[PDB]
Design a protein around this nucleic acid. Structure first.
Length: 163
RNA sequence: CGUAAA
């Protein structure tokens, strides 16, 4: 819908193919999970710049999955295909400051108030996930757990949603 | 200096 490629699948022959890191963190509270964001907040987006432009400026550093732009308020939300890629964008992209864009973390998944925007993850208690959120966490195309059921301690990358 | 759509 807001994706570049709406119907794509996360499979070896797709050049956008990515693995789905799942680890388990013993220090999480009972019935809590950890979700690393793939969503990026970009601000200072000039008025002349569009969705395809933003995608292309990040091309060197990361392959872009989706772009919700809001030209009037000068911001956009850009999901990239992997957490590794997002982290690379936050360090290396626009390191000189030639472009007017500023890159900070964003929240694609779970409650907003569970997110650490400095480090870029959410520690979410499972009771604050909708049936939908629990569904997408396991069944998602990019990110998620890919079939591993949700349990205390589980850590995964931001799953794709339906909107 | 703008953190949203479900």
């Amino acid at each position: 819908n807001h994706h570049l490629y709406p119907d794509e699948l996360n499979v070896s022959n797709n050049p956008h193919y990515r693995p789905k890191p799942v680890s388990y963190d013993s220090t999480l509270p009972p019935d809590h999970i950890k979700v690393y964001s793939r969503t990026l907040f970009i601000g200072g987006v000039p008025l002349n710049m569009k969705e395809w432009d933003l995608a292309n400026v990040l091309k060197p550093f990361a392959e872009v999955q989706s772009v919700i732009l809001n030209n009037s308020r000068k911001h956009a939300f850009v999901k990239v295909y992997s957490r590794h890629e997002a982290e690379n964008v936050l360090q290396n992209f626009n390191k000189d400051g030639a472009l007017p864009l500023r890159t900070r973390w964003g929240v694609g998944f779970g409650p907003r108030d569970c997110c650490d925007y400095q480090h870029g993850y959410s520690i979410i208690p499972m009771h604050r996930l909708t049936d939908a959120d629990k569904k997408w966490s396991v069944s998602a195309q990019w990110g998620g757990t890919s079939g591993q059921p949700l349990v205390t301690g589980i850590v995964f990358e931001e799953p794709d949603i339906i909107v």
